[PDB]
Amino acid sequence: ASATARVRIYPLALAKVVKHAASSLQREVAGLLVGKSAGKVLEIWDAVTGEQYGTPAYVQLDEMVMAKVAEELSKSDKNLYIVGWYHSHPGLDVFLSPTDIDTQKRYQAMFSKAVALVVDPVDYAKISSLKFKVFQISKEGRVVSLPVS
Amino acid sequence: IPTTENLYFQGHMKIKIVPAVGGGSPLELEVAPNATVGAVRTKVCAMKKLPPDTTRLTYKGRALKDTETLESLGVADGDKFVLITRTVGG
Ligand SMILES: [Zn+2]
């Protein structure tokens, strides 16, 4: 179906995403997912961010954030890299919009196993959990929500 | 000496291009000072099987325009570029 079979997110990385989102309920926020693939499993080890502009309906991360983060990871002895991105959708529920899909297609072109994490800070799933999904564009071009642990 | 061997050695400046996303190999391209950023990005996208209209090269702390020459940027043998893509949501 899809390049990535499932996603494993380090709890602190998820916590960083949720806190970032929850700290700005008045606009979408975005950032980058750092990790590595392990076979068909995508590991998310960290989430990082930087300068950006956003509104309740839109967000763009300054492109120099990615440039800085990629160069740092490449220079370091860690075998970690950017594996995806995240953004929030306060009060708008969890899906990939047409804009998001275009961004995600471009991520996947560079790294087939890339994923997009979307979080809605104002809601909780259902036992409770955080309201988020991790998406990928499948081999036939459909958005699929991946299994996450 | 094959007629095209001369073309192989044109430009003894080596540049390193780091793909921003994924852990894939950096590219080490042999280029001339008179090359455009666009010409570099074209070769990078060919090597990585990317479309041509979705990425940008960065150098130091700025995104480059495809029309700029490496010469105009003060690029030297060994310098490093990052190939980025946009991160935009809605
Ligand atoms: Zn979105």
Author numbering:
A (entry chain A): -3 to 122, 126 to 148
B (entry chain C): -11 to 78
Q: How do the authors describe this structure?
A:
The first complete archaeal Ub modifier system, including E2 and E3 enzymes, was discovered in 2011 in Candidatus Caldiarchaeum subterraneum. C. subterraneum Ub (CsUb), E1, E2, and E3 are organized in a single operon, adjacent to a second E3 protein and a JAMM protease (CsRpn11) with high sequence similarity to eukaryotic Rpn119. Our bioinformatic, structural, and biochemical results reveal unique features of the archaeal proteins, but also remarkable conceptual similarities with their eukaryotic counterparts.
The structure was solved by molecular replacement using the CsRpn11Δ149–202 and CsUb coordinates and indeed revealed the architecture of the CsRpn11–CsUb complex. Interestingly, the CsUb C-terminal tail is now found in a more elongated conformation, extending into the CsRpn11Δ149–202 binding groove which is bounded by H3 on one, and the Ins-1 region and H2 on the other side. Via an induced-fit-binding mechanism it is now ordered into a β-hairpin that associates with a newly formed β-strand of the CsUb C terminus. The result is a three-stranded β-sheet, which positions CsUb correctly in the binding groove and its ultimate residue Gly78 precisely at the cleavage site. In the CsRpn11–CsUb co-structure, CsRpn11 specifically interacts with C-terminal CsUb residues up to Gly78, after which the protease cleaves.
